[PDB]
């Protein structure tokens, strides 16, 4: 017993065809959080 399919993505662009957005994925989002606590303590200078 069959049923219709519902696409997970918009239709991709074919070869040779004119430009459009199509099935292209978005760029990676902004970076957040890191070794924030004791950052300057770890980076601290030393000489002989």
């Amino acid at each position: 017993g069959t049923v219709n399919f519902k696409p997970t993505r918009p239709a991709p662009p074919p070869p040779t065809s004119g430009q459009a957005s199509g099935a292209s994925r978005p760029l990676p989002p902004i970076a957040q959080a890191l070794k924030d606590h004791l950052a300057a303590y770890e980076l601290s200078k030393a000489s002989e």
């Binding site: 219709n4 399919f5 696409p7 997970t8 993505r9 239709a11 074919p14 065809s17």
Partner: protein, 67 residues
């Protein structure tokens, strides 16, 4: 004849996404249409092997003599 099925000729060899229920077809392949309009520019078909999946309308051309 009444209720005769619709056929398509592939323009370019397509490759299905994992989990998208897409139909991997070859350039110049013949398939029958099961759903010519599903949303987002897509369609559904059936091949020689009898497998179904989603296919872009921008990748296949619909044949004449449909009824």
């Amino acid at each position: 004849g009444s209720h005769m099925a619709t056929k398509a000729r592939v323009m370019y060899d397509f490759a299905a996404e994992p989990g998208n229920n897409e139909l991997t077809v070859n350039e110049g392949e013949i398939i029958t249409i099961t759903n010519p309009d599903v949303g987002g520019g897509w369609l559904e078909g059936r091949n020689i092997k009898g497998e179904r999946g989603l296919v872009p309308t921008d990748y296949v051309e619909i044949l004449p003599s449909d009824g």
